From a paper:
PB1 domains are protein interaction modules with critical roles in the assembly of protein complexes involved in autophagy, signaling, cell division, and redox processes, as well as the auxin-response pathway in plants. PB1 domains form homotypic interactions via conserved electrostatic motifs molded by basic or acidic surface patches on opposite faces of their ubiquitin-like β-grasp fold. While type A and type B PB1 domains can form heterodimeric protein complexes, type AB members can mediate interactions with either PB1 domain type or engage in homotypic interactions to form homo-oligomers or hetero-oligomers. Our cryo-EM structures of filamentous p62 and AtNBR1–PB1 assemblies revealed that the presence of a tandem arginine sequence in the basic motif of type AB interfaces is required to stabilize a polymeric assembly.
Of the three PB1 assemblies studied, AtNBR11–94 (AtNBR1–PB1) and p621–122 (p62-PB1) formed homogeneous filaments of constant diameter that appeared best suited for high-resolution structure investigation by cryo-EM. Image classification of segmented PB1 helices revealed that both AtNBR1–PB1 and p62-PB1 polymerize in two different tubular morphologies: a projection class with a ladder-like pattern, we term L-type, and a projection class with a serpent-like one, we term S-type. By indexing the layer lines in the Fourier spectra of AtNBR1–PB1 filaments, we concluded that L-type is a two-stranded helix with a pitch of 77.2 Å and 11.47 subunits/turn, whereas S-type is a single double-stranded helix with a pitch of 68.2 Å and 11.55 subunits/turn. Using the derived symmetries, we determined the 3.5/3.9- (L-type, p62/AtNBR1) and 4.0/4.4 Å- (S-type, p62/AtNBR1) resolution structures. All four structures form tubules of ~120 Å and 150-Å width with an inner diameter of 45 Å and 70 Å for AtNBR1–PB1 and p62-PB1, respectively. In the absence of prior structural information, we traced the AtNBR1–PB1 de novo. This de novo-built model is in close agreement with the 1.6-Å crystal structure of a polymerization-deficient AtNBR1–PB1 mutant, which we solved in parallel. The main interactions are formed between a double arginine finger formed by two neighboring arginine residues in strand β2 (R19–R20AtNBR1/R21–22p62) stabilizing strong salt bridges to acidic residues (D60/D62/D64/D73AtNBR1 or D69/D71/D73/E82p62) in the OPCA motif located in the β2–β3 loop and the α2 helix. These interactions are assisted by the canonical-type B lysine (K11AtNBR1 and K7p62) in strand β1. In addition to the canonical transverse interactions, the helices are further stabilized by longitudinal interactions Y14AtNBR1/N28AtNBR1 or K102p62/D92p62 and R59p62/D93p62 to subunits of neighboring strands along the helical axis.
Residue numbers in the entry: 5 to 92
Amino acid sequence: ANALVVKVSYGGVLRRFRVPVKANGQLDLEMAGLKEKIAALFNLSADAELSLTYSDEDGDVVALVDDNDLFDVTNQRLKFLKINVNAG
């Protein structure tokens, strides 16, 4: 019945917000729902490209591209997700 704490950080200011999950177990948003949510925090122009890369369990710098890999963050069993923004 619990959320995933997501911390993002662009222009060297870390932020943090939470995202709930269903009863079923998947995250209750998608990338188009996510990337326009990040553009709210940072006052970025939404037409700009975002290059979002999270952290794996065993420390790789993975890419995010699709709602297929957002499913994987639940099964990855991470304590809090961290997503870096690279624009322009």
